[PDB]
């Protein structure tokens, strides 16, 4: 869900 | 000393002003609310009532009586707070996740006691209501999923729920495709005055959170179902300008103590003075030179967070501070890498720490309310409208960044998402419905619900983008940010001309149009208001929508007096003709003309009401649903596929990839089958022996005779791709199959073949529902879709192979929009089954190892490859190829490096292939002995 980068 | 009484989170941070509404309408005692989600911790300390004697269900016996009344023979009482639990998806093999549903439920109705380990008590919006907890999860398809939560809705209504929160959804799905049972459940809830609140979704726009959609393609909404149902209240996520946050403290050069927000994964030691060191973006080991024993301070960018965190641990860091590379960004929850403490901070705070002298930082144990780096700003992840059918969603916005609530195993955590926004609005809706039972007692429940939704949307505050100097688009924020104080105080609301909703849909517009709204006054005295409309569109950066608003102009303030207990219409003329040239230069297929009609008691006072309007300057229903074929791209690129600039015609196939994240574009697929595998299936080899494999490739692509591991597009003189099949059952270029990158949803996708003489010779089975390719990610959807129903094997209606010639492979599909014309994309496909006529005799020259053929090959389609293979055993079986010399002969070698192994004459095979895949293979021995 959250940005990985 | 009496027992310690802790403050609640809302006592310190209440961005939506829930306390004002609670002062008017209570905290939920005697009321029941329902949460439909994926799983719950039913034993959480947050599930408690202050006075169970006021509850609707005082015991398991009261609940079973209600069940018997409605014929419900499943589900159970749990405790005084959780009056009902049922799992509607028990046939699922996967384990139950309890985090997300517990978190949502805590926002709606958590009621943690002062005995909690937390510094501040979680007290949800309706902390004294009882909960019905309903588990639903996908098990056997999306239709069955909808049938299951339709039953949960109906059970919730019949067990007395006043509001139902659904913090889940599936992106881009159309309302019309829901089962009738599901549509009837929504209507049943509305007929009983039961509110249903849905999350907008966390899918940003078409392309996802790492991309911007293309300015040529304005229908970039990704809101799905259940949110797309008109009767629900769909909630987007934004960040307020302040938030209760954990903090860290640093001594600066000219401000002594300086507190900054941190968002931590795992735990730093509170009140411990850590040292830190700058480590660039954490990409090289040299970055972590002075990091041993300290906190690595790392800038966002280039590599993944988990990579930066692991690299810091490798160099002996005790923790990680990662600061944003965006200005006014949002806190991002960092991944847990082997328990490593890691905190995210803003760019301003990161740059401050970088240039700070005393590089020592201390984490504080008590959270406090600090300004947010983002200021008031809509969440980047929040799903944009419009719905598949083109209706206006979301409806409203609520805080959804880093919300602290209950999770599994009696714990608490912060989470971001529209799933956190929705239960806050659900709680506000429930309390406003309670207020209206006293304020409007002669209405029915359904009339009170309809009023509450209109007041919530009207009284919501249109959020303003300070950087762009315009209001955030209604397709992103709906009717504004919810405000429980304004909503509780409201005696007026505003709707469209037909009194159906607090939003105005204008469908297609020209540059001149009118916005008509009705102002409803429910008070005993006449009221005078000033109104004005904003006129705005999308901001555009180069070829992309910026996902930001562009102000065009605002109308002049006008006046209206609404008599008591009555309503009046007003009409605002809009004329954007002077902008059309510049806007059409940016958005050539049309653009939205949208805004808000804003109402005030006096032009210098604060906004009292606001209603959004949306129109499309163009023909929205007939926007192209399909991205043009990759073959028609000048630079070789597409939305999800970047080309090799030094080779724009290169187009490699699937290869040995496991996932299909590469090559997502519109094209035709086929298969390449080497001659060795064709032979092994003629002879009957069980499990294949050879070094070559069958590969899925794109039609119209061909390797070079001097193999280099790449395929390339070939085209006719006119420019179309050279697509050709040889339907002879050998698996080499036998078929074509449609692969599509859909920019919009579509229905009734079907492939047909035309003989270019005026007849349809074949028609595929129909694919009824097509969903837009709104991302290119395994966690959501891939950037293109392969449609197996469109596979054409070269046969006709009756089942006979069609004759040699060129045909039209036609793919038809229709957009979801009402009255949309059918669209289609055509491919020229050659059929040719003519076997190559190769030479049957050959003489060999022992002097120079040159093999002379008796005749040159004869093929119907142009020659693809003339080669001589040789298979040798290398460390147990490789196969390489030889190209013909310029005089026609082939030079055969005597060995082959691996070591070095000799080559017998029995190892060579003459292989001839045409551009349709027709192939002949003959051992060179049979050529010599003949
Ligand atoms: Ca074939
Ligand atoms: Na509003």
Numbering used by the authors:
A (entry chain B): 83 to 87
B (entry chain A): 94 to 781, 785 to 972, 974 to 995, 999 to 1030
Please quote the authors directly.
The Streptococcal C5a peptidase (ScpA) specifically inactivates the human complement factor hC5a, a potent anaphylatoxin recently identified as a therapeutic target for treatment of COVID-19 infections. The emerging view of ScpA and related subtilases is that selection of their substrates is a dynamic two-step process involving flexibility in the domains around the active site and in the C-ter of the substrate. Surface plasmon resonance (SPR) analyses of the ScpA-hC5a interaction have shown that high affinity binding of the substrate is driven by electrostatic interactions between an exosite on the Fn2 domain of the enzyme and the bulky N-ter cleavage product (PN, ’core’ residues 1-67) of C5a. ScpA, a C5a inactivating protease, represents a novel enzymatic approach to therapy.
Introduction of a D783A mutation in the Fn2 exosite, located approximately 50 Å from the catalytic serine, was shown to significantly reduce substrate binding affinity and kcat of the enzyme. X-ray crystallographic studies on the D783A mutant (ScpAD783A) were undertaken to better interpret the impact of this mutation on the specificity and activity of ScpA. X-ray diffraction data to 1.9 Å resolution were collected on a single crystal of the D783A mutant of ScpA (ScpAD783A, referred to as ‘D783A’) at the Diamond Light Source, Beamline I24. The structure was refined with PHENIX to R-work and R-free values of 19.84 and 22.89 % respectively. The data allowed for visualization of the catalytic residues and confirmed the proper folding of the enzyme. The final model includes D783A residues 97-781, 785-972, 974-995 and 999-1030. The electron density could not be assigned to three disordered regions (residues 782-784, 973 and 996-998 labelled ‘a’, ‘b’, and ‘c’ respectively in Fig. 1a). Note that the disordered regions include the D783A mutation.
